[PDB]
Design a protein around this ligand. Structure first.
Ligand SMILES: Nc1ncnc2c1ncn2[C@@H]1O[C@H](COP(=O)(O)OP(=O)(O)O)[C@@H](O)[C@H]1O
Ligand SMILES: Nc1ncnc2c1ncn2[C@@H]1O[C@H](COP(=O)(O)OP(=O)(O)O)[C@@H](O)[C@H]1O
Ligand SMILES: [Mg+2]
Ligand SMILES: [Mg+2]
Lengths: 41, 53, 7, 370, 370
């Protein structure tokens, strides 16, 4: 889901190292619950 | 931005309400210099092996 | 007062 | 036996070289009667000096001859020295050299005045004058370090090296025991106790020395004191009245670390010590951090060693190691260090002989003993 | 409208916000008949409060509920406030907020009970406590200066650089109009007049208010009075006798500048002003010197402003200029300043609401008010 209007842009630093080593790659079911709750909260 | 995250977590995410009491060793570890500690211990090894010879 | 003076 | 007379704003300690404790320790006050005398034949004196003034302090106006480290009355200072030798010590200075102690960053006028007064009124054969802060480390047994000299005058932080005082690195601080005593009675009026006269100032000083202490955490202690009555302690006045102080115990000594309570812009003794160290060279910074020594009666509060160590640790880099040395004899550290220096065999070399003084004049004190 | 009640040690002034003068001004005395009622025709009330007691002061033991600015008897204070709102102001406190005044450096229990009484006995919608000296500066249209307040119990010097007073430089002395009254009747016995009872105390206060004056040069004036005549004034007592006072005219006000006559070690009213200024910053000292303001009934003597200026000039450096401001209506300066503060629109957010007091109890007065 995308907003209908442009909003404040927060800037992060991209991980130079491979994302496979990071925990972001791991598709745990807990992360999926966050997206579902956020879309309905 | 962060102040909404407080009310957002409290209203819908009760499990994330307070993580600071859960994790307290990290704050204590923030008062110590890793490089200085590593150098300090490494000095002890160098001194003793020089003592052995 | 309590200690000192009269008040 | 060379006398070691350590004049001070609050108390003056006198004794002999080689002893481990001063022979006479009496308050440095000169009181005069403010009421006319009605009983004749008593032979009452005109001025009372030392313990006599304290015993009869009810009918006297106690005036401290030394205020903020500078002698504002050179006529009363001679009275105290006269009382120290003939009365308390009962030794004539004719056959005993006298060692005096200065204060850091002392004006040159006081240096010559002390030499001139004693070499003529008392005509002692020899003299040597040393810094109080320098002697503080000598008693502890270490020659290199930073001394947090505090007392009833002005707090001084003197980072001495090889037994020599660094002139540029000395930082002054007016926060002393007298300021806390004046601040204690200002906050004691919140409970209904009114001490205003100079006679009652001595009473408040007794309260400060017995009940006051330094709390490790100010914010945590404030809530505990208000909630429960455990921290309250009872003190008895000379007239028999019993007083109770609840949270003034850790609020008066706290003014040392937070001078904003008294309205002074200068930082506390925790930051002044750190600032003085930074003024020194980088190479000798390692030695001074691990050889800091407290001295004087002001630093005798319980828990001041722990509070100082914790607060200076955060300001100092994590690499630096903090070791606050607090000997139990720090009240007489100035005098004990003086006795050690006097008893040295090599100490005879830098005497200021009476014969040499006449040919050179009072100006010899600046160049001979520095 | 908000009632502005300025309770004082000698007199209490009550009125309305925005007015230029207090509505009711009556003495703050509560008297009880020591004799036994013999007749039954009249009511013969248990106690009389205010000017009612003054008229019948012959047969009553007048007692002041306030001594040195501290309410000693809270049972009588409730009588006075009940008399102010229901007999003099004839208004219901339940509808109008009440503004009170408290002297600086007072016990915390003094202003804690004031909040409790207001919010539980009279059920006032709002309340506030302000320093007496701070309001005295507002009446003069200034926000930077030093106020020399002096009444019956307290003589406090409060240097106010900005809208808020400086807390660390406030000096308070327990020498005021009531102390001089006790001294006037002590030296009046030298001429053969004896005033002992509290009823006779009110006679002495009338003599002090009308004949006493401050001499520019005490030593010179004493010699002038030694030549007799040209200085003795005749006063008529309520009995009918005529009494004459000579050197007592200026001796009683001279106890202000020389408290040694009363046996108090505290400094005079001229030195305590200079000492208070010396505790402030160097930059601010210039403004405080040129904006000195007097207030209170004690400073209403003829010539006190002239004498005070001379004494401060000698102590102060000659570079600075001294300008003592003595407004004609300085007797009611404390109330007039309070009227201005209450009428301000910004002050509407500083009131202590009834609900706010309930959640925190009486202790809220320390955190909110100053
Ligand atoms: N046990 C104690 N606890 C707290 N304060 C003390 C204690 N003993 C002395 N003091 C304070 O230290 C002061 C004594 O200072 P002192 O060290 O004699 O000055 P100097 O360094 O000039 O000799 C006294 O005024 C007193 O208020
Ligand atoms: N005209 C005057 N001359 C000298 N003293 C006065 C005069 N008027 C009042 N006083 C003194 O001022 C005192 C009261 O002054 P004031 O400040 O108005 O009341 P309070 O001190 O109760 O606030 C009285 O005790 C009286 O001695
Ligand atoms: Mg000292
Ligand atoms: Mg008043």
């Amino acid at each position: 889901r995308r907003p209908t209007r442009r909003l404040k842009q927060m800037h992060w630093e991209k991980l130079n190292s491979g994302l496979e080593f990071t925990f972001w790659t791991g598709p745990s079911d807990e992360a999926n619950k966050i997206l579902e709750t956020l879309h309905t909260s | 931005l962060l102040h909404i995250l407080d009310i957002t977590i409290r209203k819908h995410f009760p499990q994330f309400d307070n993580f600071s009491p859960e994790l307290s060793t990290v704050t204590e570890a923030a008062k110590l210099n890793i490089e200085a500690i590593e150098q300090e211990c490494s000095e002890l090894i160098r001194g003793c092996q020089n003592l052995q010879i | 007062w309590x200690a000192x003076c009269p008040a | 036996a060379a006398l070691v007379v350590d004049n001070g704003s609050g108390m003056c300690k006198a004794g002999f070289a080689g002893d481990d404790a001063p022979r006479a320790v009496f308050p440095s006050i000169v009181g005069r009667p403010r009421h006319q005398g009605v009983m004749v034949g008593m032979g009452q004196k005109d001025s009372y000096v030392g313990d006599e003034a304290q015993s009869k302090r009810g009918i006297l106006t106690l005036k401290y001859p030394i205020e903020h480290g500078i002698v504002t009355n050179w006529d009363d200072m001679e009275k105290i020295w006269h009382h120290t030798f003939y009365n308390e010590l009962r030794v004539a200075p004719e056959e005993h050299p006298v060692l005096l102690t200065e204060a850091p960053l002392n004006p040159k006028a006081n240096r010559e005045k002390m030499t001139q007064i004693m070499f003529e009124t008392f005509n002692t054969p020899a003299m040597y004058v040393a810094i109080q802060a320098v002697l503080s480390l000598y008693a502890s047994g270490r020659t290199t370090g930073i001394v947090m000299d505090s007392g009833d005058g002005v707090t001084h932080t003197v980072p001495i090296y090889e037994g020599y005082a660094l002139p540029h690195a000395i930082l002054r601080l007016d926060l002393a025991g007298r300021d806390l005593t004046d601040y204690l009675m200002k906050i004691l009026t919140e409970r209904g106790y009114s001490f205003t006269t100079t006679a009652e100032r001595e009473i408040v000083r007794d309260i400060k020395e017995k009940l006051c202490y330094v709390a490790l955490d100010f914010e945590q202690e404030m809530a505990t004191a208000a909630s429960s009555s455990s921290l309250e302690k009872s003190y008895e006045l000379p007239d028999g009245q019993v007083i109770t102080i609840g949270n003034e115990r850790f609020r008066c000594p706290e003014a040392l670390f937070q001078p904003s309570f008294l309205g002074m812009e200068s930082a506390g003794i925790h930051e002044t010590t750190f600032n003085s160290i930074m003024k020194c060279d980088v190479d000798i910074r390692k030695d001074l951090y691990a050889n800091t020594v407290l001295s004087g009666g002001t630093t005798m509060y319980p828990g001041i060693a722990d509070r100082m160590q914790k607060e200076i640790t955060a300001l100092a880099p994590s690499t630096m190691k903090i070791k606050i040395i607090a000997p139990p004899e720090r009240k007489y550290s100035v005098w004990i260090g003086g006795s050690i220096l006097a008893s040295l065999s090599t100490f005879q070399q830098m005497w200021i002989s009476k014969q040499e003084y006449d040919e050179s004049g009072p100006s010899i004190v600046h160049r001979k003993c520095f």
